[PDB]
Enzyme design. Structure first.
Site, PDB file in Angstrom:
ATOM      1  N   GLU A 111     -15.378  12.816 -11.860  1.00 35.33           N
ATOM      2  CA  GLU A 111     -15.099  11.099 -13.012  1.00 35.33           C
ATOM      3  C   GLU A 111     -14.517  11.637 -14.157  1.00 35.33           C
ATOM      4  O   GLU A 111     -13.461  11.020 -15.187  1.00 35.33           O
ATOM      5  CB  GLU A 111     -15.927  10.629 -12.737  1.00 35.33           C
TER       6      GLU A 111
ATOM      7  N   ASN B 173      -6.042   1.475 -16.035  1.00 35.47           N
ATOM      8  CA  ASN B 173      -5.414   1.445 -15.019  1.00 35.47           C
ATOM      9  C   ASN B 173      -4.383   0.726 -15.230  1.00 35.47           C
ATOM     10  O   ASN B 173      -4.226  -1.027 -14.764  1.00 35.47           O
ATOM     11  CB  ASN B 173      -6.318   0.996 -13.595  1.00 35.47           C
TER      12      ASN B 173
ATOM     13  N   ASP C 159      -3.300  -1.991 -12.511  1.00 35.10           N
ATOM     14  CA  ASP C 159      -3.986  -3.317 -11.818  1.00 35.10           C
ATOM     15  C   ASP C 159      -4.867  -3.725 -13.222  1.00 35.10           C
ATOM     16  O   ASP C 159      -5.919  -4.565 -13.028  1.00 35.10           O
ATOM     17  CB  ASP C 159      -4.871  -2.979 -10.639  1.00 35.10           C
TER      18      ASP C 159
ATOM     19  N   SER D  48      -6.777  -2.854 -15.189  1.00 35.68           N
ATOM     20  CA  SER D  48      -7.958  -2.281 -14.792  1.00 35.68           C
ATOM     21  C   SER D  48      -8.496  -1.161 -15.725  1.00 35.68           C
ATOM     22  O   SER D  48      -7.762   0.008 -16.205  1.00 35.68           O
ATOM     23  CB  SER D  48      -8.991  -2.601 -13.924  1.00 35.68           C
TER      24      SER D  48
ATOM     25  N   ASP E 134     -11.530   2.245 -16.395  1.00 35.69           N
ATOM     26  CA  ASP E 134     -12.666   2.856 -15.105  1.00 35.69           C
ATOM     27  C   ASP E 134     -13.620   3.763 -17.452  1.00 35.69           C
ATOM     28  O   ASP E 134     -13.247   3.992 -18.041  1.00 35.69           O
ATOM     29  CB  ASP E 134     -11.829   4.158 -15.102  1.00 35.69           C
TER      30      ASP E 134
ATOM     31  N   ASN F 205     -15.206   0.669 -13.357  1.00 42.11           N
ATOM     32  CA  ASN F 205     -14.520   0.157 -13.481  1.00 42.11           C
ATOM     33  C   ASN F 205     -14.552  -1.117 -14.089  1.00 42.11           C
ATOM     34  O   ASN F 205     -15.673  -1.961 -13.176  1.00 42.11           O
ATOM     35  CB  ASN F 205     -13.844   0.110 -11.892  1.00 42.11           C
TER      36      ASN F 205
END
Length: 130
Positions: free
Chosen positions: A35, A46, A49, A51, A53, A60
């Site tokens: 990750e 991202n 959308d 959002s 991380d 998220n």
């Protein structure tokens, strides 16, 4: 902070992650590795959308933490996303525990399915004294 492998392994164990909700320490290590590369300040936007991380487990902003700019977001861990960018990973760990308390468990992270599931993950904790 960019953790060294065994340093992180010992930290996670002390934070009670070994066997949490049936997930072995090596699985958590494999997850953090893919990750963020064990990097607490890692952030990934991202564009698709709106959002982001955050942190070592790449949590998220749509479901786990609040950053204020993500549409239709919930803050299940009841934390500002800034808390997931600290060198101290206690908050990030408390939130990861919450994530796996849901039905999907460790499967909630797609990276785990691609890189860890059904693999020999022993290497992630070998020689760390955990």
């Amino acid at each position: 902070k960019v953790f060294e492998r065994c340093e992180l392994a010992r930290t996670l164990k002390r934070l009670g992650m070994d066997g949490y909700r049936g997930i072995s320490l090596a699985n958590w290590m494999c997850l953090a590795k893919w990750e963020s590369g064990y990097n607490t300040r890692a952030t990934n936007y991202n564009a698709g959308d709106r959002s982001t991380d955050y942190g070592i487990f790449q949590l998220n902003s749509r479901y786990w933490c609040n950053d204020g700019k993500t549409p239709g977001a919930v803050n299940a861990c009841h934390l500002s996303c800034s808390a997931l960018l600290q060198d101290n990973i206690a908050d990030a760990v408390a939130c990861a525990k919450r994530v796996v308390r849901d039905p999907q468990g460790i499967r909630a992270w797609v990276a785990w399915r691609n890189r860890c599931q059904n693999r020999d993950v022993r290497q992630y904790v070998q020689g760390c004294g955990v």
